[PDB]
Each structure stands twice: as structure tokens, then as C-alpha cells.
Amino acid sequence: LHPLQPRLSPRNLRVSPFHARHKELGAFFLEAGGWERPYWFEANAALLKEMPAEWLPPARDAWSGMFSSPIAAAEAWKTRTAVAMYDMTPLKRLEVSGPGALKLLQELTTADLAKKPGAVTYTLLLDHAGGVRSAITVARLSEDTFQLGANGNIDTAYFERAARHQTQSGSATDWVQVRDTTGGTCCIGLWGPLARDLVSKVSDDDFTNDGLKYFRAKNVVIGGIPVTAMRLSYVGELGWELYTSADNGQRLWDALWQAGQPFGVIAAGRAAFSSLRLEKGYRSWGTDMTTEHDPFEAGLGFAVKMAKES
């Protein structure tokens, strides 16, 4: 069996709010964690006739060509030179809330999270030996509410137990609740050099550098939909992760899609996504590092604030 080989059943268990639009665009779906994830979009085949030859990869052998397509090259191309919409809905999304939330995260992570709300921080979770249990993002949305981009249900269970333990043994001001909100929310990664040109057509919020700096978050309205925008890009380009409730997702998608037409916006899938993030050197927990590695071996020293008290 090839490492990407999907099951044929059961399928379509979990789908993002954009699923109808993705099928319209001829998404090739693979599954992970029950979620259907586009790996590329057949609609983008039409772009290969226009793509510069410098972007066209050589033939693949039969094995590396399984569950791959030249279309991924066109999607990488447009992400690097135009603007792309990636479905980040399946990214594990945890809400950690309550008066003991900051205290919990200060102890579990390698970052100083005690900053006025709006900061996004890439940070690690270690075990007592210094091995890397996880690498996550923490966005402080308000005094007592943080949204985490985690790595899966191992993280979820880790936070659940730790929050329960803190709550049980703490005061009236140490209680903290952890919710897995992934299934109730969605996210579009809107990335590429024309990302500002696009979003400014559908929002009156300020998306310039002055309005939202790198690794910051704020609430905005796009196409009429309340969104939490976070400025970062696992693909290494300008733009934002745009989060909203599942019921609003399709509208947000359609609004952006329409705004993006003059900029040549495309839907982009996981094959391009993985290639682009590797060009950026961004680590993926579970393969690039595990608890067998410390942050310095993995080249993640920068994410560890050794000056923290604890």
C-alpha cells in the first residue's frame, strides 16, 4: 500500500462548510481524522496551459505519482504569485477559557503568553525530559480566552486532563475549561501576494501592516461575516487565517471567491500546501519532531523562552 492510500469507505464523515463549493471545483479528496481534505482541484487543470515552464515539474515515477498530480504545481504557482484559498478547517482548534486559562498555558507551553490580547504565538509543549510533545499556536483572543491551533486529539486529551487537574486543586480563580471547537467552526487560509488586494474589496477593516501586524489577531467583518483574522501563513506568503462559525463559512467563502476573480484567485489543496511549507522549513509535529527530540535538535530553539520562570 502507498502511504497516501485512502479507504473507500467509510468516507464523508466530516466535511467543512465549503464542501459543496469544493466539489464544484472538482476537489480530489483524501481523508484524515474523519475529515475530507482536498489535495488539489481539477478546476485548476485549466491553468497548466498558462503556467510558465519553469514551474512544471519533471515526470514522476509510478509510486511517487500515486495520489499526486501536476495540478499541485499550478496551485503552488498561484499561491506564490497571485492569491489562493486553502481550507484550514480540519486544523485542530481548541478554546481554553476561564480565569485560570493563562495560568494553565503559562505552565504547559514554552512561551510567555502574558501579553495584551491579540498576540499569536508559535510555541511548544514539552514533557519533563524536554522532548517535544507538540508544536502549536496560541492566540489570546481576550483576557480569559485563548484559541489554540493544535496537532490532534492527543493534544486535546492532554489539555483536558491538565485543565481538570488545575480546576480541581485550585481556587475560584483557577478554573479553566477546554473545548474542541474544530467541528463547529471553519477557517480559510487566504495567502499570496495579492491577498490584500482581494480582501480589501470585501471588508472595511484595515488589513495593511499598520492595521494588523504579523502574528497578531483581531476581529473583522468580511462579506458581512464576523471573522477572527490571524496574520500568519504556513505557506510563507502574505495573508491571514480567517476563522468563523460553521454556519457563516459558505458565505465567507463565496464573498472571497467573488472578490478574487479579477486577481485570479484559486482554491488550493494539501499537495501544494505541504510542498510550500517545506520550502519554508516549517516543522510538522509527529514526523519532523516527536518526544524523542528536544527543541534544539529540531531547530526550534527560537520558540523556547528559557528566561521564563517556569
Ligand X SMILES: Nc1nc2c(c(=O)[nH]1)N[C@@H](CNc1ccc(C(=O)N[C@@H](CCC(=O)O)C(=O)O)cc1)CN2
| Residue numbers at the binding site for ligand X (CB under 6 A) | 91, 122, 135-137, 149, 151, 215, 230, 232, 234, 241, 282, 303
Of 149 and 269, CB closest to ligand X: 149
Size of the site for a second copy (CB under 8 A): 51
Of 47 and 90, CB closest to ligand X: 90
For residue 56, give the DSSP letter: P
What is the C-alpha to C-alpha distance for residues 144 and 45, in angstroms, rounded to an integer?
Answer: 46
Of 11 and 280, CB closest to a second copy: 11
Of 25 and 303, CB closest to ligand X: 303
Q: How far is the CB of 64 from a second copy (least distance, A)?
A: 10
Of 95 and 288, CB closest to a second copy: 95
Residue 204 binding target from ligand X, a second copy, none, CB below 5 to 8 Å by type? a second copy
* Among 85, 91, 139, 225, contact with a second copy (rule: CB under 8 A): 225
Please calculate the CA angle 67-31-240 and round it to the nearest 5 degrees. 95
Tell me which residues in 85-124 interact with a second copy (CB under 8 A): 89, 97-98
By CB under 8 A, is residue 182 in contact with a second copy? Answer: yes
What is the C-alpha to C-alpha distance for residues 176 and 170, in angstroms, rounded to an integer?
Answer: 10
Query: To which H or E segment does residue 140 belong?
Result: strand 132-142
What is the C-alpha to C-alpha distance for residues 244 and 251, in angstroms, rounded to an integer?
Answer: 10
Q: How far is the CB of 81 from a second copy (least distance, A)?
A: 19
Question: CB–CB of 99/144 below 8 Å?
Answer: yes
Strand partners, 30: 37
Per-residue buried b or exposed e for 234-255, using 16+ beta carbons within 10 Å of the residue's own CB: bbebbbbbbbbeeebbbebbeb
Question: CB–CB of 190/88 below 8 Å?
Answer: no
By CB under 8 A, is residue 32 in contact with a second copy? Answer: no
Question: CB–CB of 271/237 below 8 Å?
Answer: no
Q: Which residue carries 467573488 as its cell?
A: 258
By CB under 8 A, is residue 169 in contact with a second copy? Answer: no
Of 16 and 121, CB closest to a second copy: 16
- For residue 165, what are the CA distances in angstroms to 36, 117, 119? 34, 25, 26
Please tell me whether the peptide bond between 226 and the residue prior to it is cis, using omega within 30 degrees of 0. Answer: no
Residue 137 binding target from ligand X, a second copy, none, CB below 5 to 8 Å by type? ligand X
By CB under 8 A, is residue 17 in contact with a second copy? Answer: yes
Residue 225 binding target from ligand X, a second copy, none, CB below 5 to 8 Å by type? a second copy
What is the three-class DSSP state of 109? strand
Residue 172 binding target from a second copy, ligand X, none, CB below 5 to 8 Å by type? a second copy
By CB under 8 A, is residue 3 in contact with a second copy? Answer: no
Helices 71-81 & 270-279 angle (0-180, nearest 10): 60
Site residues for a second copy per CB under 8 A = 8-17, 19-20, 23, 35, 45-46, 48-49, 53, 59, 61-63, 66, 70-71, 89, 97-98, 170-172, 175, 177, 181-185, 204, 221, 224-226, 245-248, 250-251, 254
